[PDB]
Amino acid sequence: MNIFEMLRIDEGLRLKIYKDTEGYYTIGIGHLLTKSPSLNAAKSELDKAIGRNTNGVITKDEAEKLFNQDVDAAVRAVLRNAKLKPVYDSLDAVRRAALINMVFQMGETGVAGFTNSIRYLQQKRWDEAAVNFAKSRWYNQTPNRAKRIITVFRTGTWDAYKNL
């Protein structure tokens, strides 16, 4: 397991535009297209990101290329965010993927908003972190995925993902 494989499982893979949980137009492996509620706007953003007349449809390779850009972006976000960095730094490699996973999913700001949970993470207070993470809109929104994430933070292993 690694963050790519992990995110691959959490985001899945779609070759056509779709909407994410918050209703945003997305495509591929969780590639958010735009925050405009306009599909047309989305198709336009898609052709721009792909640099082709896509027609709302991409190829797998196309999805992976966006995915790479996106993981990189999530990594930069964790490494560059004042709040996040210190925590990232204190984590083992496994819990580091979990954290990147969250940033990928909801952006650095969102993640930074889990004030206490991140605090507990930095301090290795695993169960306390888990409990606080579980008390959230994030958790309610995408419970299945939040649950795996939290298990990782809780256990520090890939148990939640490895037999998927």
Catalytic residue, candidates 10, 11, 45, 62: 11
The domain spans of the chain are 1-164
Q: Which amino acid is at 28?
A: G
Give the list of residues 6+ apart from residue 24 with CB closer than 8 angstroms, or none. Answer: 32, 33, 34, 35
What CATH number has the domain spanning 1-164? Answer: 1.10.530.40
72: annotated active-site residue: no
Annotation says 20 is catalytic: yes
- How many angstroms is the resolution? 2.0
Q: Say whether 132 counts as a known binding-site residue.
A: yes
Report the distance separating Cα 95 and Cα 123, nearest Å. Answer: 13
- Structure determination technique employed: X-ray
Active-site option among 5, 20, 47, 64: 20
Burial (Cβ within 10 Å: 0-12, 13-18, ≥19) of residue 127: exposed
> What ranges in the chain are assigned the alpha helix state H?
3-11, 39-50, 60-80, 84-90, 93-112, 115-122, 126-134, 137-141, 143-155
Residue 38 known to bind ligand: no
Alpha carbons 125 and 112: distance in angstroms, whole number: 17
Residue 19, strand partner residues: 25
> Which tokens go with 127?
């169960």
Separation between Cα atoms, residue 43 and residue 33, nearest integer Å: 8
Contact assessment for residue 46 and residue 36, using Cβ atoms and an 8 Å cutoff: no
Question: Is 117 among the annotated ligand-binding positions?
Answer: yes
Query: Do residues 100 and 71 lie in contact, with contact meaning Cβ atoms separated by under 8 Å?
Result: yes
Establish whether 153 is an annotated binding residue.
no
**Nearest alpha-carbon partner for 3 in 84, 72, 100, 92:** 100
Contacts of range 143-146, beta carbons closer than 8 Å, 24 or more positions apart: 145/10, 145/105
Q: Round to whole Å and give the CA distance between 128 and 154.
A: 9
3-state secondary structure of 53: coil
93-112 helix and 3-11 helix, angle to the nearest 10 degrees:
50
